[PDB]
Each structure stands twice: as structure tokens, then as C-alpha cells.
Write an enzyme that holds these catalytic residues in place. Structure first.
Site, PDB file in Angstrom:
ATOM      1  N   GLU A  63      19.011  15.889  81.881  1.00 53.94           N
ATOM      2  CA  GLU A  63      19.881  14.730  81.753  1.00 53.94           C
ATOM      3  C   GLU A  63      21.350  15.140  81.693  1.00 53.94           C
ATOM      4  O   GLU A  63      22.212  14.442  82.224  1.00 53.94           O
ATOM      5  CB  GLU A  63      19.529  13.881  80.523  1.00 53.94           C
ATOM      6  CG  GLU A  63      20.256  12.536  80.547  1.00 53.94           C
ATOM      7  CD  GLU A  63      19.586  11.459  79.719  1.00 53.94           C
ATOM      8  OE1 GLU A  63      18.343  11.483  79.580  1.00 53.94           O
ATOM      9  OE2 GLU A  63      20.311  10.573  79.222  1.00 53.94           O
ATOM     10  N   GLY A  82      23.370   6.736  81.278  1.00 53.21           N
ATOM     11  CA  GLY A  82      21.985   7.079  81.556  1.00 53.21           C
ATOM     12  C   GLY A  82      21.035   5.935  81.264  1.00 53.21           C
ATOM     13  O   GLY A  82      20.953   5.466  80.129  1.00 53.21           O
ATOM     14  N   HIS A  89       6.471  18.839  83.555  1.00 53.57           N
ATOM     15  CA  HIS A  89       6.578  20.236  83.147  1.00 53.57           C
ATOM     16  C   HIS A  89       5.494  20.960  83.934  1.00 53.57           C
ATOM     17  O   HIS A  89       4.317  20.638  83.809  1.00 53.57           O
ATOM     18  CB  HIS A  89       6.364  20.309  81.644  1.00 53.57           C
ATOM     19  CG  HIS A  89       7.384  19.527  80.879  1.00 53.57           C
ATOM     20  ND1 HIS A  89       7.054  18.625  79.887  1.00 53.57           N
ATOM     21  CD2 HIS A  89       8.733  19.499  80.980  1.00 53.57           C
ATOM     22  CE1 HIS A  89       8.159  18.078  79.411  1.00 53.57           C
ATOM     23  NE2 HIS A  89       9.192  18.592  80.056  1.00 53.57           N
ATOM     24  N   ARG A  91       5.111  24.677  84.346  1.00 53.53           N
ATOM     25  CA  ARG A  91       4.619  25.962  83.878  1.00 53.53           C
ATOM     26  C   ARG A  91       5.406  26.412  82.672  1.00 53.53           C
ATOM     27  O   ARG A  91       6.567  26.027  82.500  1.00 53.53           O
ATOM     28  CB  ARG A  91       4.752  27.002  84.988  1.00 53.53           C
ATOM     29  CG  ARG A  91       6.182  27.265  85.429  1.00 53.53           C
ATOM     30  CD  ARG A  91       6.217  28.374  86.463  1.00 53.53           C
ATOM     31  NE  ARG A  91       5.442  28.017  87.648  1.00 53.53           N
ATOM     32  CZ  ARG A  91       4.870  28.899  88.461  1.00 53.53           C
ATOM     33  NH1 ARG A  91       4.981  30.199  88.216  1.00 53.53           N
ATOM     34  NH2 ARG A  91       4.188  28.481  89.518  1.00 53.53           N
ATOM     35  N   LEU A 107      23.376   7.538  95.894  1.00 57.03           N
ATOM     36  CA  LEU A 107      24.560   7.173  95.116  1.00 57.03           C
ATOM     37  C   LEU A 107      25.060   5.819  95.595  1.00 57.03           C
ATOM     38  O   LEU A 107      25.772   5.730  96.597  1.00 57.03           O
ATOM     39  CB  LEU A 107      25.662   8.222  95.303  1.00 57.03           C
ATOM     40  CG  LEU A 107      25.279   9.664  94.955  1.00 57.03           C
ATOM     41  CD1 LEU A 107      26.415  10.607  95.327  1.00 57.03           C
ATOM     42  CD2 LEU A 107      24.966   9.763  93.474  1.00 57.03           C
ATOM     43  N   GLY A 108      24.684   4.765  94.880  1.00 50.24           N
ATOM     44  CA  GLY A 108      25.105   3.432  95.266  1.00 50.24           C
ATOM     45  C   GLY A 108      26.272   2.915  94.452  1.00 50.24           C
ATOM     46  O   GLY A 108      26.777   3.607  93.567  1.00 50.24           O
TER      47      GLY A 108
END
Lengths: 139, 146, 139, 137
Positions: A63, A82, A89, A91, A107-108
Site C-alpha cells: 500500500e 486508499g 501471499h 511463499r 489511471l483514470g
């Protein structure tokens, strides 16, 4: 380049200082024409009690770099918030540092979608994540 | 009751010392017959550079309590491994500590799905997350991994 | 290649007959060494009331091709079960057919993770999805 | 009460007619002050080739009822657009119809987040989903 703002790795790390980012040992490490990376150590600061990288912390890294990347693709007067994030995940990781690369999916004007893939020092994929950001006008 | 392993909040927090959990100030704080909670302060260790709780760290807290909860629902000889997690950030948090409560959605023989909701000290919902766990038979896992 | 089961597109479409797959007009259309695709028309069978591809149906297409891909990557006697799936809808689609391509992220002994990207006839990305599968022994 | 718009179940089913929704046999079946449901049959239109409900189609139902619920919580002149959705398939379903209930998690000025839980006719949870919507004019 893809970026709309000017920046330096030194300045980005300065911006991320004294927060959860620097607390986790995360460092904005490199960038290209349409991607940017951050590294994070695999140690007691980022591991589960049983010696492997903490998956939750891997998402925190995802993030971080994805949101930072998003903000760098906007002109002044606009920023990102956000909305949600998911991750698989793949490994366990028990040493060295992992590298998370953020690349854009879309990307708007109102929404940005980022892909964040995290690899070990052996260049093996350990986590894949997707981040959804809202583009807000600071009006 | 959900639990299949005995435990104490004191021992769990001890077990979590010197890890990403303690590093973030996370404390396993309470539990019931079918739920368990963990708290985390909103400070320099967990905030973004602009004064609010870091959304990624909130997910770190969710994965922590959800995974712990799942491991406590299995008998000795079995454990869980985080497969995937998702979350929606609903509102910014700038002070006090947040509380994450893990409740089971489905506890299967091979897979567990957990709900983790995070609330502010004002009892407001700031994050919702779902965690998917793989149930691992330690004996079997060792025989195929060593 | 990546595949462990022998197959022909004809037989796969036969396998999918009289099911949700054929009902949505989905056709397993092509495959490479490490990818497989399925197409789906954008019409009354797959659109939202307002004339654009229904996002939920895009996910149905994603789960379809990703699950098929996963089973074809296992030896006979084994198959997969869908555990979870997520997707981001990037843009509206009003006509033509969309093509979903499934590629592996990680293929483990017990869990598989797949990437499914859906594009328009103009080759524009309209949906990105990730699918997590459980590997099972039919015996 | 959550609803900002006025409607009857008949109106809603009319709105969804001649689309993927009616094609899948989905029917908006009931609603309360803060929840709304839709049912869907488990048959050849919605099953995987091996006889159980198709997980992808379950997500289709989830997005349908969640998106509808979101638009109904907005004033006239405003609607929603699906941004993203996720779901966990908890168990196979081989007969009858399933019921998806949408309940809000958070309704903001620009973004809405919905929870959609799907149960079998035996009231067993078979799928849980979360949907993120953008509010538009």
C-alpha cells in the site's frame, strides 16, 4: 515519463520519515519510466514470531509504494486516498530484503488501480497485490 | 466454544514479542467464545507521514489477529498459513488506538475464512477485511517439505 | 509446456456445454504454452440494464477461464476448486466480444493463484482479476 | 431507512429485465429498511459443467444486488458504478435457489461499500462478497 510531479529518492524518503514507513525500515529504492520500487528488510521488525516475513506487513509495504506511486501521477492540487487493497501471499521469506514494484493498471480521472508485486533478493515472487485509489481534487 | 488450543493473552503477547506484531505496538487484548481482539495505537509507529493511521498497517493488524484466531481453532499438529487478504478503508483515524475483532465466516477442514473488522475508540468502523487461511497438517507438510 | 492434461478446444467447449458457460455465450478460444483464453459477447445475455457489459458477468468469465486453466495444469485424477476471486472494473464495454486471458501467478501443490485480464476487441483492458484455487485429489 | 428512491419489487424486476440479470433468472425478491435480497436458481443456466453452482455466477448475483441497493440509497439524478468486487466461495450448492442479501458497510458522498452474503435454501452461507461502488451523476 509517467510521473506528473518532479521528485528524488532522497526527497521521497525524507517525506516518508518518522512514520510507519520508516518504522518498518521501508526505503523508496528506485524508479523507472512507469514503475517505482521500495525495499523492506526481513527481520524482527517485519517477521511473524516464527521467523518468516509477516504477510500483513508485506501488504503494508504494497500500500505504501502503490499510494506513493499514485500521488506522483497527479498534478499539484490533487492527491490519492486508499480505497481498498488485496494480496495473495505466495511463499515464505526468511532473510534479506524484499522489493516491491508498483506499476499502473489504470489511471483514470476519479480512480487509479495499481499492481504491486513483491520479490525476494532471489527475484522470486512472494506476494502480489492490487490497490484501488480514489483521486481527489483538493478544491 | 471455537478454540481447540489453550492460551492466555499474557502468553500470546509474550510469543509475539520481538516480531512485527510488537514492533507495531499491537496487543492481543480480549477474547470470547467465538471472537478475539487485538488493539494497536495510532502513533509514529503506525501512522502515515500526514498524521493518520496507515491503511497498510491496518491490514497488518487484521492479518495478525485473523491468523492467530485461526491457529487457535485447530488441534495440536495443525496450523494455518495466510493465503490472501483484502480490505476496504472506510475512514481516517488520527488518535487513540484501534481495535480489530476477528470472527469466523467458515472453518473448513482445508480452508478457513475470517472476518476482521476494525473500530476506533469512538466505536466507529474504520476498516473491514477478509482473510483466507490454508489449514496445514504439520506432519504431512514436513513429509513433503522437510 | 505448462499443461499436464491433454485437451483440444473442441473438447473443452463440449465439456462446458449446457452450463453457465454456454449460457453466457462463452467460448474457450485459444491457448499458448502458458496462457489460455475464452471469449464472451457483449449483448442482452451479458449486459447491465443500461447497455454496457455487466461487471459481475465479467467476473464469471474470469472465474471460468481461470478455473479451467488451473485444472489443465494438474495431472489426471486431480482438479481445482475455486476459493476466492476479486476484480477491478476499469472501463465500460458496449459492444463486440471481450477476451479473457488466464496466466499463472503461482502453481503450488495445494494452492494455485491465477491472473485473468479481460480486454475489448480494441485490445483495451476492461477488467483485471485474480483467482485463488484449491487443488484436490478426486480420490 | 436507507432508501432515498421510491420503488416496488415489480419496478426493480422491470428495470433488470432483458439483461444479464433476467438471463440468469435473478429476481429481486424482498427488502427491508436496510437490506434487499435477490434470488437465483441453481440450474444449467448457473451451474458449472459438473453440477454445482458456478462461483463466478454467484459473484454476478452479488454485484447485481449490491449495485442495485447502492443506487437506491441515492437521490434522484444519482447512480453508482461498480469499481471492484471480491468473494470467497464457502461451499458447493447443487439445487434449488440461493438468496443474496445486500447490506451497507459504509455509504459516503463519493464511495459506497457493500456486503453481500449468499445463502442456500437451507440457510447455509455459500458465498460472502464485498463490493466497492463509485457515486456518479
Amino acid at each position: 515519463m509517467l510521473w506528473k510531479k518532479t521528485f528524488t529518492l532522497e526527497n521521497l524518503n525524507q517525506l516518508c520519515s518518522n512514520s510507519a514507513v520508516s518504522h518498518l525500515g521501508i526505503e523508496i529504492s528506485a524508479f523507472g519510466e512507469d514503475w517505482i520500487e521500495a525495499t523492506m528488510p526481513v527481520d524482527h521488525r517485519t517477521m511473524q514470531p516464527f521467523g518468516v516475513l509477516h504477510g500483513g506487513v508485506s501488504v503494508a509495504l504494497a500500500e505504501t509504494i502503490g499510494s506513493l506511486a499514485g500521488s506522483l501521477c497527479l498534478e499539484e492540487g490533487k492527491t490519492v486516498v486508499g480505497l481498498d487493497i488485496n494480496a495473495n501471499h505466495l511463499r515464505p521469506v526468511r532473510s534479506g530484503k524484499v522489493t516491491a514494484r508498483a506499476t499502473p493498471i489504470n489511471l483514470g480521472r476519479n480512480i487509479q488501480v495499481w499492481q504491486i508485486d513483491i520479490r525476494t533478493e532471489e527475484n522470486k515472487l512472494c506476494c502480489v497485490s492490487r490497490l484501488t485509489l480514489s483521486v481527489i481534487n483538493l478544491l
